[PDB]
Amino acid sequence: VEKLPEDFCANPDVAWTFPKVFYTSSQVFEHEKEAIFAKSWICVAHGSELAQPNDYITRKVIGENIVIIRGKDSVLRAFYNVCPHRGHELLSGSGKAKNVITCPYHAWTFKLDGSLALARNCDHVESFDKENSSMVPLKVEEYAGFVFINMDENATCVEDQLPGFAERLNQACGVIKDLKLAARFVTETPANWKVIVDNYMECYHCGPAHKYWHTTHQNWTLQYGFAPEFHGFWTWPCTMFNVPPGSNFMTVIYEFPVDAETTLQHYDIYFTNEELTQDQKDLIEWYRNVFRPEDLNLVESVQRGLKSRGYRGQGRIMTDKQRSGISEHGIAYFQHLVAQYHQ
Amino acid sequence: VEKLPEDFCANPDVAWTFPKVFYTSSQVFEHEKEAIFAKSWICVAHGSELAQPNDYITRKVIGENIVIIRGKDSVLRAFYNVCPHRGHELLSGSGKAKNVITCPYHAWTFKLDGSLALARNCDHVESFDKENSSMVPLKVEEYAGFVFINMDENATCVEDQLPGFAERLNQACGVIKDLKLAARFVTETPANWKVIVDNYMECYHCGPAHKYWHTTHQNWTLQYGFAPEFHGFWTWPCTMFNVPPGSNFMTVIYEFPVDAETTLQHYDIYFTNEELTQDQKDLIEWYRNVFRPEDLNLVESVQRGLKSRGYRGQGRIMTDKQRSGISEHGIAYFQHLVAQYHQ
Amino acid sequence: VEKLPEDFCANPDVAWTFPKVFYTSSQVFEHEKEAIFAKSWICVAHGSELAQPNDYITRKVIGENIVIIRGKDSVLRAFYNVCPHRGHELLSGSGKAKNVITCPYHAWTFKLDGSLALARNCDHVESFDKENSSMVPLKVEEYAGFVFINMDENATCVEDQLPGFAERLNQACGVIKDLKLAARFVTETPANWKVIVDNYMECYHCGPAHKYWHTTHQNWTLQYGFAPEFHGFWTWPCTMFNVPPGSNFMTVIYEFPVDAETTLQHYDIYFTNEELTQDQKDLIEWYRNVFRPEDLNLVESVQRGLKSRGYRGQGRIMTDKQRSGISEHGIAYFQHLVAQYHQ
Ligand code: FES
Ligand code: FES
Ligand code: FES
């Protein structure tokens, strides 16, 4: 019951952010949960976490607990982390699964491809089938050295969602296959997922709050320049890849929305060294205690302020004709794509 | 707006649990709160707690704070624990009331039968009546050595709800009158009340999670066998009585539902000894640290899992034709009775 | 969809409190939030906090974060505490602002009259105006030595809301201009704002819970007598001023409702001495540890009790014909005024 014009933010030069209801309303969220996050490829991890047989990880997004597991046969698969019998969760955290997944409730065992191996007493229950009593899968794809899932089984590949992205990311960082997760920050954030994307898409505050060109592509954008290149990739719907100068490491921001005003964030820092140099250990500390706190306070305060009847519905996107670094035109592009799911 | 067929689970051999909405929906809960828990006899305590004049207890169920009190005249009564003047609560916890109940707000005093004794300045207020300014009662019955309340004042007795139960319980345990509460575990549990009953009604997991026959009766069931007999009584709507081998003590599980995904549980352990033997003190510790944690984790994980779009609506009730101990047919009987309130 | 007769409580001699829904319902609250608190003068502070240039305070009411600030030019102003750019909050707590208000996000600066002074890069954004990019004001008035705001910009003055109040308050306390805030108690209270007003409007319990005449006026009442006079002012919608015997100090109760069952309360204690006498420091301790706890427990227990189906809808307002100190007739007057917004 809450819609937007199609030309919304099509012209970045004269554009305003969403009406406030799109940042706060439970009905806008449930629509986006089904129309966007249930039908789009969602990035969940770098490939290093899932590189070896029996390696698995677990993730929560839009209230779906997901397990991604590298099979004994080295095939990467993803399932809903819920037992098909009576609904117990199957696995927790991350690590190396064993050769079978045993449900902690009634001890049904599944192969690592989801196949029900043994369900106790099953051959004496009437009208039971081993198949169709399997763990329920969803699509998974390795792309650009990262791992994407999709809850729509008719989905086509990541490349159809992010045309050109993988080729450009490999041109930004040539050692992505060699990266290892050196630190992760988990934060449940009281801000709508679109508020967090807004913050990322702009460099109006890189100096008053923390050689610059922001170019839009098909469902992704890139913030590029020289500082020694630096890259900042935003990709639909909300995963950000940073390649700081030197191009030898990455940080990735994963957004796992929970509800209209809550978002789970993973802030991952990837280096190529197993043992960190002191420069890297110090850099992790600067990210945890300085940089990321400043960013989270910003979106939290903004989430509070925009509910106020004193915030007049929308806010002005500060685009300049020359598209300088402090131009907010990236926001306009993102909100235009979002408007397309609200016609 | 969420209904069920009448033959739902009438045939245990080919049966599935409820659609997931009945375990999660606030509208299913409010309907069950009024149609089931406001019109059924609810077990709240063993008779020992209320055996002496002025003994009282307090209980919370479906958001109703109840007081049960043995009158000075030795008559057992139950009232809503709310002052009829402006709504302050009257009593807290349990113990021995005094000869009058004095409201902590404006100090109206009531006899232990709810009769307003003194309301300050009342004879100068126009159109006031002492009677019809009393504490508001509800039905209470002592049955099977336990205490049952009912919020429907037109209710008939417990026996019409649980035909045969008291006779069978006395055949399971002959010293019920002599039992004393040796320990109580209070836990607010993030699981729908029907999930907790499901867990109790099955012995599919007594070995992989913690001479067996489960027979259904009129609104109650019994899990029976030899291990020296052992008994497990489920009674409508959700109170469970355990009589472990030796038949000399009992544990009782009381379920006081709060909302669609929350249930208050009392786990009571009753012995006949005032001073416990070391075997009993150790047994209380095994129940608190081992047994009950395992049970609560099970239902909590199940409550989370069944919301997942990966849990395909319902789950298969694993009944075998021979009705062995690991047969889940008890669940089918319970869900059939519940379906009867959702036509 | 929840209304009241107009003669509701017009006759204090035969009157009952509201039906329970008006104390609990989110729909009754949202209506009162817009019809009452968005259109009425709301008291927020004593004038001493805002007496000097650049002095400011912040307040939360009905989910609106407000800033009141004495301009460099000594003019008192109030604004919504939200940046007009993208919605960050501007200021926090209380104290002395600087000559400009700099938004912590993108560093737009505002004059202390809300005027946008500098918005970085603004002259290169198309169709931008400095004016109409200002902080959004609301009405503020100094009245009776206290500070009132109003969110309706077409409002007339406080005097039209509280006719006679300021003249009577100055007759109760002659040194209001000289008062200094000696202590504040902040408590988020789980009780509807109308429950807290009910508690204040009565002296049925001044003796069983903690020369007396309660006279009603236009939107305010006064509890008066000798104990050496004492005064107790209630004013619409919910601010209470106490002038204890000796008339040399005041306590003020501010009610900032949050939702149907939550109210933020400030309990302010004002003396004329900058350095407190031991009698005053002890009196602050008696208020914090004894008096106010008793009052907050009362309304919290009442909020719980009135939801119970055992509380029969309404409660009797105990008015006597002679209108003695323990007469509850003040409540009737307040609820009659409230009924006028629920026709
Ligand atoms: S819930 Fe997993 S085996 Fe029963
Ligand atoms: S609320 Fe119990 S006497 Fe007034
Ligand atoms: S939000 Fe205040 S300057 Fe951008």
Structure described in brief:
It is classed as oxidoreductase. Keywords: Apo, Rieske, Iron-Sulphur Cluster, oxidoreductase. Three copies of one chain form a homotrimer. With 343 residues, the first copy, chain A, is of the alpha+beta class.
What does this structure look like?
The structure is a homotrimer of 343-residue chains. Chain A is of the alpha+beta class. The first copy, chain A, has 2 domains: 204 residues, Naphthalene 1,2-dioxygenase Alpha Subunit, Chain A, domain 1 (Alpha-Beta Complex), CATH 3.90.380.10; 100 residues, Rieske [2Fe-2S] iron-sulphur domain (Rieske Iron-sulfur Protein), CATH 2.102.10.10. Chain A is 22% helix and 29% strand. The first copy, chain A, has 7 helices and 17 strands. Chain A has a 7-stranded antiparallel β-sheet with strand order 1-10-9-4-3-2-5, with no helix packed on it. In chain A, strands 11-17-16-15-14-13-12 form a 7-stranded antiparallel β-sheet, with helices on both faces. In chain A, strand 15 and strand 16 form a beta hairpin. The radius of gyration of chain A is 22 Å and the shape is globular. Chains A and B meet through loops of A and helix 6 of B. The structure holds FE2/S2 (inorganic) cluster (3 copies). One FE2/S2 (inorganic) cluster binds next to loops of chain C.
